[PDB]
Structure to design on (68 residues):
């Protein structure tokens, strides 16, 4: 899957927020997490996770990497 700049509803097509957010809430479950919310950081579409198991909080797909 790798990382992706576009993973939030605040990217360009907010029409489908459920889809954009899915790349956070669902992406976390794949990393043995609980939930994940995305927010525009300094005008950049950043995806944040929460309720994780390997940290229980802010954990980016990069920190939850298991292939590196």
């Amino acid at each position: 899957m790798d990382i992706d700049f576009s993973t939030c509803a605040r990217m360009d097509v907010p029409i489908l927020k459920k889809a954009a957010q899915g790349l956070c809430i669902t992406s976390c479950s794949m990393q043995n997490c609980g939930t994940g919310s995305c927010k525009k950081r300094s005008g950049r579409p950043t995806c944040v996770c929460y309720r994780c198991a390997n940290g229980g909080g802010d954990i980016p797909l990069g920190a939850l990497i298991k292939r590196g």
Remarks:
- Residues 1-68 form one domain.
- The radius of gyration is 11 Å.
- The first helix runs from residue 17 to 29.
